[PDB]
Every structure is written in structure tokens, then in C-alpha cells.
Design a binder for this molecule. Sequence first.
Ligand SMILES: O=C(O)/C(O)=C/C(=O)C1(Cc2ccc(Cl)cc2)CCN(Cc2ccccc2)CC1
Ligand SMILES: [Cl-]
Ligand SMILES: [Cl-]
Ligand SMILES: [Mn+2]
Ligand SMILES: [Mn+2]
Ligand code: NA
Ligand code: NA
Lengths: 199, 189
Amino acid sequence: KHHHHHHDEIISELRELCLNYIEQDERLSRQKLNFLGQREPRMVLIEGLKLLSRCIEIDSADKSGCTHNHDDKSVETILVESGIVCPGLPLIIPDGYKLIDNSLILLECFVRSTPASFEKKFIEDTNKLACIREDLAVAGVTLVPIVDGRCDYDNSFMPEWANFKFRDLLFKLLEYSNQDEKVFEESEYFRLCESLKTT
Amino acid sequence: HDEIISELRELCLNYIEQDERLSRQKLNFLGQREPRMVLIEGLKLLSRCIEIDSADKSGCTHNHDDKSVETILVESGIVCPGLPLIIPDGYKLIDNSLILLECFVRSTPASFEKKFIEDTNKLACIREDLAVAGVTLVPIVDGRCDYDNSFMPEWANFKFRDLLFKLLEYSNQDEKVFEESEYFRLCES
Ligand SMILES: O=C(O)/C(O)=C/C(=O)C1(Cc2ccc(Cl)cc2)CCN(Cc2ccccc2)CC1
Ligand SMILES: [Cl-]
Ligand SMILES: [Cl-]
Ligand SMILES: [Mn+2]
Ligand SMILES: [Mn+2]
Ligand code: NA
Ligand code: NA
């Protein structure tokens, strides 16, 4: 009834935003539910950040004409599920993928907030996909690699204002959580932990 | 994780002697599902074992219900207003002497000495208040260097701690992914 705007209300507002202002796309159902079920501040924070990330990844997949990698399949798994074997193959989990004929589109997306880190991340993700172009070619597959670098957190599943307010509340939860942890590290419980070093 | 919590519960149930003073904290421990809470209640359960041994060795009543000093006195008909809020690991009123006990575990000499002085000061700060009310404080500080206790076999005490430590390890390893991952950038953004 009376809003005092402390951490429990911060968590409750994040849940309202999640429920009522993030589009009801079925690919988001599992992470929304994961988020809504968290009770510990640090865990609300973490799954909240992951929910936001998932909105951006799926947004990228849709705009890039790719299938979003819902279950975090590896490239090997994606291949093996279509009857194609590539056995010497490093671990790569793409944000998106699409096998058309003999062509395998693979998508990496990211958000960076400065030009220097934008460019650095773009190079890293590009090299990441490139290093398996040859193996795929051996197995008869043409790699079509896509790196979608973004400069902000905008996405089609949340209105701009809600996206901003969701991030704003996550930041306030982070501040609370950090203070909660500092207070914990001054408690006897933390001392008893330290002592558990007996092992 | 489930296996870890499941192993911890079996130890709690089968290899901690059934002294009834431990029953409540065992039940508190057994109802925890969340890792951070399992760890805290597990450490409290080990602490209760040590405290009860200490009380039994000091001719004191273990403070099972977390009574305050103020409460302990009232129950014996003694009124002492203004007392700061202190909850002792143990107590006993004999004649006009109130034995108060503080127990602790520390695993280095440096941390041992620091805690010993802290609990000593903690009790000392109400000596005058009690004397005004006609009560002589008998303050006991009992420092332990490990979690050894009369309620558990040494092998079970070690396994219990080993499991709690693995829980703590997993949590530190998790927070090192929130540290190095895309979700970190977002949070520091
Ligand atoms: O450092 C210690 O050895 C120690 O015995 C600590 C405690 O008893 C407190 C923490 C605690 C430690 C162990 C257990 Cl089993 C339960 C609680 C903290 C001090 N107290 C804090 C407090 C003060 C006033 C009112 C309530 C709580 C009580 C709980
Ligand atoms: Cl498609
Ligand atoms: Cl804005
Ligand atoms: Mn205590
Ligand atoms: Mn104590
Ligand atoms: Na499409
Ligand atoms: Na805005």
C-alpha cells in the first residue's frame, strides 16, 4: 500500500516490468520465469541481466535472419543435428544460426559503450568465427559469419522507457547488494567461513 | 549441488548425536535449499555444537533460545533497565553472581587473539550496570581453534566441513562468471 522504495520494492517493480512490459515472445518464457522465481537480491540482479541480454540476442537473431540459439547448442551439435559431421571442432556457442543448403550462417552479437571496446570486441568475435571456416569447408559447409555489434541496449521486446527503467532498477539493486555483501563481510558468519579454511 | 545438499542432510540426520538442544538448529539446517543459506545454517549448526560443549564444560545453561541478558535476569526476578542488547552463548545465575559465557572458533593465532579480546570487551561493558543492580558478572570467554565437538565423529565433522567448503567454492566460482561474462559488462553499464 505505501511505497517506501527499498530493496523488496525494487525487486517487486522489476517483476512488474518483466511481466507487463516485456513482449510475450515465447522464446523469452523460460528466462522470464527464471527471473520471476528469484528471491535473493544478487540472484534477481543476475537473472535480470540475463533476461535483458536474452532480449538483445533474440532481437539480433530476428534482424539478422537467423534462428536464435535458444538452448546454447554448440556448432558441432548444430551440425550433428542435421546429419553433418565435423569432428575436429573447437567449442563455439553462437547467438544465432541458420543452415541453408550447404551454407551455415553463424551470428555473434554484443553491446559495447565505447568505440575502443566496440572495435576490440568486434575483432575478437570475428576471429572467433573465422578460425573454423576451414574445418567447415572440409565437411562441405560454407561458413557465413555475422558479427552484430551494438552501441546500446535497445531491442524490439521492450519499450525504450521500460528498458531504461529496468536498467535503472537493476543498478539500484546492484548498489543494495554490494552494501549487503559489505555488511555480511563484517559479520561473524563471514569469520566462521574464513575459519572453515580448516580444509 | 543437490548431491552435496543431500549428503549434508544425511550427515546431519545420521552422524550428529541427538542431543535435544541441537534439534531446532538441525531443523533450521534441513529446511534450507538455497546454497548461501545452507552454508550459513551449516556453520551455525557447527557453532551450536561447540557452544553446547563449552556450556557443559563451564557449568552453564546453553542459550538455546537466544535470550538477552535483560531477559535472563527478569526470569530470575531481577530488574536491570538500560542494559545494552547482548545475547551470550551461555549463562547461569547462582546466588547474586551471573555467569555469562561467550564461545568462538578461530583458526589462526592472529584472529584468535583479536576475537578473544572482542568477546572479553563485549561482556565487560555491562559489569558496572549489573553491579548497580546488585549482580556480580562472572564473564567467561572460551576460544576454540577448530570445530571439534562431542556430538560428531571426527570423520563426519571433516566431511561436513568439506561439503560446506565445496558449496562455498562453487559460489565463488559462480561469482567469477558474473565477473567475466557479457552480463558483467551490462552490469558495469
Ligand atoms: O561472534 C560470536 O561468537 C557469536 O556468538 C555471535 C552471535 O551469537 C551472533 C551471530 C551467531 C553466531 C552463531 C550462531 Cl549459532 C548464531 C548466531 C552475532 C552477535 N549477536 C548479535 C545480536 C546482538 C543483539 C541482538 C541480536 C543479535 C548475536 C548473534
Ligand atoms: Cl529464419
Ligand atoms: Cl532515457
Ligand atoms: Mn552467540
Ligand atoms: Mn559465540
Ligand atoms: Na527469420
Ligand atoms: Na528513456
